[PDB]
Amino acid sequence: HMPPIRRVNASQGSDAAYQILQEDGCVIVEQVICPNIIAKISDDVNRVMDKATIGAKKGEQTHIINMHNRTIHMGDLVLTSKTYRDELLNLPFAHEVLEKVFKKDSGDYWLNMGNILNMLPGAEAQRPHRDDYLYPVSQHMDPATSPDLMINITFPLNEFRHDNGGTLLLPKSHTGPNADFYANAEDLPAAEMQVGDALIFTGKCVHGGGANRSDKPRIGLALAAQPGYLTPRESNVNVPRDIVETMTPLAQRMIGWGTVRTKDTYGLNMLQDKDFHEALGLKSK
Amino acid sequence: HMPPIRRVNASQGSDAAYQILQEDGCVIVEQVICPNIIAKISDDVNRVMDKATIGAKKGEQTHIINMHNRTIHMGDLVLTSKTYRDELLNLPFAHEVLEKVFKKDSGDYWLNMGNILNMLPGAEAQRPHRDDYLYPVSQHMDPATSPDLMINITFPLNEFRHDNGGTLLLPKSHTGPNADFYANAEDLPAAEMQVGDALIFTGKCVHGGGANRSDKPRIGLALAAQPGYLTPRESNVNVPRDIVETMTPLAQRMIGWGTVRTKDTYGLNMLQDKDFHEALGLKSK
Ligand SMILES: CC1=C2O[C@@]3(C)CC[C@H]4C(C)(C)C(=O)CC[C@]4(C)[C@H]3C[C@]2(C)C2=C(C(=O)OC2)C1=O
Ligand SMILES: CC1=C2O[C@@]3(C)CC[C@H]4C(C)(C)C(=O)CC[C@]4(C)[C@H]3C[C@]2(C)C2=C(C(=O)OC2)C1=O
Ligand SMILES: O=C(O)CCC(=O)C(=O)O
Ligand SMILES: O=C(O)CCC(=O)C(=O)O
Ligand SMILES: [Fe+3]
Ligand SMILES: [Fe+3]
Numbered sequence: 001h002m003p004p005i006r007r008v009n010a011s012q013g014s015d016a017a018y019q020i021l022q023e024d025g026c027v028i029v030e031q032v033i034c035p036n037i038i039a040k041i042s043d044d045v046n047r048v049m050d051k052a053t054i055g056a057k058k059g060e061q062t063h064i065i066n067m068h069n070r071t072i073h074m075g076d077l078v079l080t081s082k083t084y085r086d087e088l089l090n091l092p093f094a095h096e097v098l099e100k101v102f103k104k105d106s107g108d109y110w111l112n113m114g115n116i117l118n119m120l121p122g123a124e125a126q127r128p129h130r131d132d133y134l135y136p137v138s139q140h141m142d143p144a145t146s147p148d149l150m151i152n153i154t155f156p157l158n159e160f161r162h163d164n165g166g167t168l169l170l171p172k173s174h175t176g177p178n179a180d181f182y183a184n185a186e187d188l189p190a191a192e193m194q195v196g197d198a199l200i201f202t203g204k205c206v207h208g209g210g211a212n213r214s215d216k217p218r219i220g221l222a223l224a225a226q227p228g229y230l231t232p233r234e235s236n237v238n239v240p241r242d243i244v245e246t247m248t249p250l251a252q253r254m255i256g257w258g259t260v261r262t263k264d265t266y267g268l269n270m271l272q273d274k275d276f277h278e279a280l281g282l283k284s285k
Numbered sequence: 286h287m288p289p290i291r292r293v294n295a296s297q298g299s300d301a302a303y304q305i306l307q308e309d310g311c312v313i314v315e316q317v318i319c320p321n322i323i324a325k326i327s328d329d330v331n332r333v334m335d336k337a338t339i340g341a342k343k344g345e346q347t348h349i350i351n352m353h354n355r356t357i358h359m360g361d362l363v364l365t366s367k368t369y370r371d372e373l374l375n376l377p378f379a380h381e382v383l384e385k386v387f388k389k390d391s392g393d394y395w396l397n398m399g400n401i402l403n404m405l406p407g408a409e410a411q412r413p414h415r416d417d418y419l420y421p422v423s424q425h426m427d428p429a430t431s432p433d434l435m436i437n438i439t440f441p442l443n444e445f446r447h448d449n450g451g452t453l454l455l456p457k458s459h460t461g462p463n464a465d466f467y468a469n470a471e472d473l474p475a476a477e478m479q480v481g482d483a484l485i486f487t488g489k490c491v492h493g494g495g496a497n498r499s500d501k502p503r504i505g506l507a508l509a510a511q512p513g514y515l516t517p518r519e520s521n522v523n524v525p526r527d528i529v530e531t532m533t534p535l536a537q538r539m540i541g542w543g544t545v546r547t548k549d550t551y552g553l554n555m556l557q558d559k560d561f562h563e564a565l566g567l568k569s570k
Contacts, residue, residue, distance in 0.1 A: 033385045057552065058560070061549070076557050105421065107421075115493060117548065135547075136514065136547060136548060137434075140426040140430070140431045141424075142425060144424045147425065151458075228516060229422075229516050231516050231554055232554070233552070233553050234555055235556055237522050237556070238564070239566065247336075249457060260516065263421060264349075265345055266345050266518075267345065268380065269518075269519075269520045271520055272361045273342060273359070283492055284322070
């Protein structure tokens with residue numbers, strides 16, 4: 001018996017989605033965002049897609065997730081899309097869920113990164129994995145009781161199905177012990193969904209990209225958030241201060257332009273023994 | 286039943302110090318740095334003491350270590366002391382020890398912060414604590430088998446004695462379970478050191494600032510390093526790039542101006558899916 005991927009409409013409230021996410025480790029939330037927003041973001045991203053890296057980045061092994069050369073992962077979305085800085089990073093449903101996940105166990109949260117997941121025609125499935133493997137401390141904690149280190153929110157930019165490689169997930173796989181093998185990709189259900197929908201799964205949910213057996217690319221956008229005490233994979237210190245001061249305080253903290261406090265009230269990422277904003281006089285929308 | 290704080294001369298090698306720190310959680314290293322280096326750094330620090338905060342920062346609860354107001358902690362040392370930037374951040378003994386601590390279990394390391402510690406006359410002792418309590422994940426890991434999350438190196442800028450509040454340590458206390466009480470500060474040995482020595486202890490070593498019963502301020506310079514995947518308490522994004530470029534690549538990585546790889550080779554603090562330096566074209570020394 002393989003349990004299916006469960007879905008809620010966003011009009012049912014982020015409590016329903018959060019209860020499915022803590023019982024299964026994954027949930028598809030339908031009609032969570034206006035599809036026109038996503039169309040603008042796909043516009044912006046397609047302009048600059050010819051400048052992205054195919055395969056692994058420099059000096060990173062590829063056998064934990066089966067990182068290969070018919071996928072494109074592209075970052076730097078903050079500079080690429082204003083609609084991303086303005087609409088997506090402030091979506092209140094997403095922050096309702098992320099606050100339910102992170103607030104008591106860890107405190108404030110920010111992005112690990114925002115990432116374009118391009119599964120090219122011909123791309124094979126990845127090895128099912130846990131994303132919290134990125135952080136070494138996660139192997140020294142019991143998954144049944146340890147706090148969540150990562151939450152992934154994936155917005156399909158075109159439609160996700162099984163045949164074009166929509167994300168494969170293993171529901172209810174998020175409490176068991178860490179293992180070097182979990183499942184074969186061919187045994188997992190795919191997250192099927194449309195522009196406007198989002199898939200949400202935790203750093204402990206077993207998942208991976210599927211095989212794109214179609215003749216068009218399958219592209220999603222993944223907002224990955226984590227506790228503020230974990231170092232983001234992507235820094236944003238090179239974003240113009242004048243761009244950053246048109247963003248909201250919450251979104252400025254998301255891209256690392258703000259102090260993050262632990263659930264114990266201690267600040268990380270401070271400037272000159274003060275608040276990040278206070279020390280810079282950083283304005284915001 | 287109380288073990289003593291063990292010490293070596295830096296001329297006995299980094300490997301001997303490392304052995305003691307592994308058996309005890311703390312080691313005093315004698316004559317590790319020219320006293321003139323520290324003297325210059327202390328003139329630099331004293332010129333700017335009028336801009337420091339006494340006691341807690343805004344919002345940070347105090348009862349876990351007993352932070353009171355006969356105590357001045359002062360960060361922001363990259364812009365205060367040039368000798369700090371050039372000399373202290375490049376001291377080879379320190380990096381040999383931090384390499385032995387961090388490299389297999391975690392990967393690259395960088396500063397939590399460099400912090401001037403001032404126990405003023407009349408300062409009472411702190412409650413003995415473990416420093417890694419700053420990071421919530423430390424409470425979900427078995428101390429006898431889990432990676433080190435922090436190494437503290439403290440240079441006295443004037444003589445540490447018991448009488449003036451020299452750091453109190455519980456040697457061999459670095460493998461026992463986490464507890465909400467470890468010992469009373471009256472029961473602990475003090476670290477007694479000259480300018481030129483250094484105390485090195487880990488984030489699982491039970492310690493605390495002692496009681497300064499003397500007439501003068503007791504001042505040390507703490508250098509707390511942690512794995513690259515933990516968010517530094519102190520950012521350095523407002524150091525002018527011209528200053529940063531006169532530092533070695535190593536010192537640059539220490540103050541957050543570089544990419545940090547985990548032991549599984551994955552990079553963190555990347556810029557544009559590249560190395561921090563490659564994407565900035567950041568020069569160095
Ligand atoms: C564990 C592992 C990694 O960790 C994760 C999963 C964690 C975060 C994740 C998020 C959710 C942000 C995303 O959007 C897609 C992929 C990734 C960047 C990813 C990339 C990376 C470094 C990597 C690996 C490899 O093979 O090449 C690349 C790898 O094994
Ligand atoms: C756990 C705890 C904290 O964690 C530590 C110990 C960890 C790192 C440490 C280093 C070693 C860098 C240092 O140089 C001196 C003290 C401190 C900044 C310290 C400060 C802080 C946030 C805090 C506490 C409190 O009460 O106010 C402040 C507190 O209880
Ligand atoms: O492309 C996907 O659907 C999943 C991407 C992923 O899981 C990864 O590479 O970490
Ligand atoms: O002041 C000292 O000697 C110790 C300081 C300390 O342990 C702390 O505040 O974390
Ligand atoms: Fe993944
Ligand atoms: Fe301490």
